[PDB]
Amino acid sequence: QANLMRLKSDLFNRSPMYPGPTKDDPLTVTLGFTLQDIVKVDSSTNEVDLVYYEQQRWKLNSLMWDPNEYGNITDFRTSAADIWTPDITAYSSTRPVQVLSPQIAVVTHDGSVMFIPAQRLSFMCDPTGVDSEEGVTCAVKFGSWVYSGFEIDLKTDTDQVDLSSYYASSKYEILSATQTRQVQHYSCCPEPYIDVNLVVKFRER
Amino acid sequence: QANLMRLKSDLFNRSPMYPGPTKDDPLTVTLGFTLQDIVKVDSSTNEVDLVYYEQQRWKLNSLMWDPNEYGNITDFRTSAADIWTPDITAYSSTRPVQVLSPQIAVVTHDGSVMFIPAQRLSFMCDPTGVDSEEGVTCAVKFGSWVYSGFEIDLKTDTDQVDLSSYYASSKYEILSATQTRQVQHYSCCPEPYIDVNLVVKFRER
């Protein structure tokens, strides 16, 4: 009965603003995608426009609370601005992403956060063959812009992009869509680099 | 006179900035659309552009007052940023919505709010058959981004969609338009998911 107001307060008002992870206080992000539609294919530029929902989930100690102390409150919704959010970027976009949905997140009492913004993304993609029965394949990597794998570990729960709500009358028919964790090693440096690779295969309907 | 400057201050200066609904404190949002224009059809992508007024209505205890204490004031207009508003979204958009009108609401002493923003929406729509006599049917679902049917319950006011001020000389003639509330249950989960389905059937004029 509005002890929620009390909670949002002492969580977001007493000292800490969370300064991000480190090699000493590392963090795991779970990434999944839901492909809604391939909107545009541009042959003159090599660009492709996607609408997908990017599900993102992590866990912070600094967000934990005893629900007994707060009217048996187990979770709440707050705007993503009120909180730290990881810096997961598409590595081959060609235009700033466009937010299609409200940017509200759910924080649970065990300190876990989930956050699913709908986005439109233009990225580098050669659509030659889209015309044929075989179609064409495009990939785009997502990863942190500033944090190594020792700082942000990036993982998925399934190889399979969710297609269960792909637009049934799209110009484009999906033949295959997959998300997979990749690790790169560099001989200078002991820390691994991580990305999730989104590969979609598709053709004209 | 000058009684309103006090009420506004008394409302927008007490701790309660409304934190949104909860399963314990559910909220009803009423949804109604006024079709102004189908502006654009794009057959190479599958997008359609609509101009519409979206009438939103809801009621909060936190916005009740007694007129007898406030110079017999029964209601006031205020900027929509001065208040909480629901996260009602088009689930199949393809671009950030464009706001066409000012964003001002009327609050009433019973705590009821009404808000009528004008908007341009791009959403997914296969326009095949639009040049025929039967035309083509398209649909857009609107719903909350973060709240289930146990937190935001979605409704419509007027049975019928308001076509009375649809642009008479539009490129596209409206054959029908309907707006219906809809409930679904998934196998996993007992709570309902609710949308308002705006189904419009149209043809080239």
Partner: peptide, 16 residues
């Protein structure tokens, strides 16, 4: 299913 609808995913985090 549930998980391709954000309100549903958000309300069922462990499942989704």
């Amino acid at each position: 299913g549930c998980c391709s609808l954000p309100p549903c995913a958000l309300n069922n985090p462990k499942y989704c």
